[PDB]
Design an enzyme around this catalytic site. Sequence first.
Site, PDB file in Angstrom:
ATOM      1  N   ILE A 182      13.055  12.680 115.090  1.00  0.00           N
ATOM      2  CA  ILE A 182      13.447  11.273 115.100  1.00  0.00           C
ATOM      3  C   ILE A 182      12.196  10.446 115.394  1.00  0.00           C
ATOM      4  O   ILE A 182      11.492  10.713 116.366  1.00  0.00           O
ATOM      5  CB  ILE A 182      14.552  10.986 116.145  1.00  0.00           C
ATOM      6  CG1 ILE A 182      15.866  11.634 115.695  1.00  0.00           C
ATOM      7  CG2 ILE A 182      14.731   9.484 116.350  1.00  0.00           C
ATOM      8  CD1 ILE A 182      16.997  11.549 116.700  1.00  0.00           C
TER       9      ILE A 182
ATOM     10  N   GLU B   9      19.174  18.878 116.405  1.00  0.00           N
ATOM     11  CA  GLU B   9      19.294  20.258 116.884  1.00  0.00           C
ATOM     12  C   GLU B   9      20.551  20.933 116.324  1.00  0.00           C
ATOM     13  O   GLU B   9      20.518  22.116 115.972  1.00  0.00           O
ATOM     14  CB  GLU B   9      19.271  20.325 118.420  1.00  0.00           C
ATOM     15  CG  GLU B   9      18.025  19.733 119.079  1.00  0.00           C
ATOM     16  CD  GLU B   9      16.761  20.562 118.894  1.00  0.00           C
ATOM     17  OE1 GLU B   9      16.732  21.473 118.033  1.00  0.00           O
ATOM     18  OE2 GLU B   9      15.773  20.295 119.614  1.00  0.00           O
TER      19      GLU B   9
ATOM     20  N   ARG C 206      19.799  21.963 112.850  1.00  0.00           N
ATOM     21  CA  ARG C 206      18.949  23.163 112.831  1.00  0.00           C
ATOM     22  C   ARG C 206      19.670  24.469 113.164  1.00  0.00           C
ATOM     23  O   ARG C 206      19.281  25.527 112.665  1.00  0.00           O
ATOM     24  CB  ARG C 206      17.795  23.005 113.819  1.00  0.00           C
ATOM     25  CG  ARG C 206      16.763  21.965 113.432  1.00  0.00           C
ATOM     26  CD  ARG C 206      15.905  21.634 114.634  1.00  0.00           C
ATOM     27  NE  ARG C 206      14.875  20.639 114.349  1.00  0.00           N
ATOM     28  CZ  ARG C 206      14.276  19.894 115.278  1.00  0.00           C
ATOM     29  NH1 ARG C 206      14.611  20.013 116.560  1.00  0.00           N
ATOM     30  NH2 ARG C 206      13.351  19.016 114.934  1.00  0.00           N
TER      31      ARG C 206
END
Length: 246
Positions: free
Chosen positions: A71, A160, A163
């Site tokens: 970000i 996250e 991912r």
Amino acid sequence: DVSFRLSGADPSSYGMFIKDLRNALPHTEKVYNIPLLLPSVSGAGRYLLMHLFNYDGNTITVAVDVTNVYIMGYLALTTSYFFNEPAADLASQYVFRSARRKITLPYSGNYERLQIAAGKPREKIPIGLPALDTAISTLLHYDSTAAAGALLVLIQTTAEAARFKYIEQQIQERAYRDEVPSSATISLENSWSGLSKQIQLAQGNNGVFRTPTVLVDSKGNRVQITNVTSNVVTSNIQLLLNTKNI
Ligand SMILES: *[C@@H]1O[C@H](CO)[C@@H](O)[C@H](O)[C@H]1NC(C)=O
């Protein structure tokens, strides 16, 4: 762009958002059937915009670098905010240029700096969809200490989760009740670069990691990941940081 609305949100709608986020990141190849993020993208195409809406329908737009899912900054009404780091300053050349003013946050975007600014480690910060709702609301009006905690929540519930399937599932479990992340969640966050590298190095090494990666599992037990047959590689990780950026 991708969007997520907290009003009426449930595990399914969040799952759809995380799917959209993953699918918005470009890749030309997969390594062990996991998308490999690109070494670089030039110009504005480097940045994905996430439109997030809090429960009341107020919105921020978050700029994400599609090569690493980092970000860079965000827009709240007519004010843009960027991390105090070169990659974020560069991003500010391309996104939210129509903001009436731009504030550079008094910290970079890495976990250690954000945790210092927030005054607590993310081990102690509850996450979940309610926490995300709070985070969006907090970011609507500038408060740098409050924003640090909000950004820790934001990064974990978006990037996250994109991912790692495990982290996505952890947030789905926290759809209506926040809870601090599991130690496994923290371990995976801390190991994304390392895992990404070793999965790529395994390509010319018969699926074997050049260096084992140490993780914590769901039962709090620490483990070594030595090769691509591990569940972390076959089931969990969804995006690889290109080794050219490691
Ligand atoms: C590879 O990983 C598997 C499953 O995690 C493990 O049991 C095995 O010992 C490893 N094999 C090699 C050759 O590293």
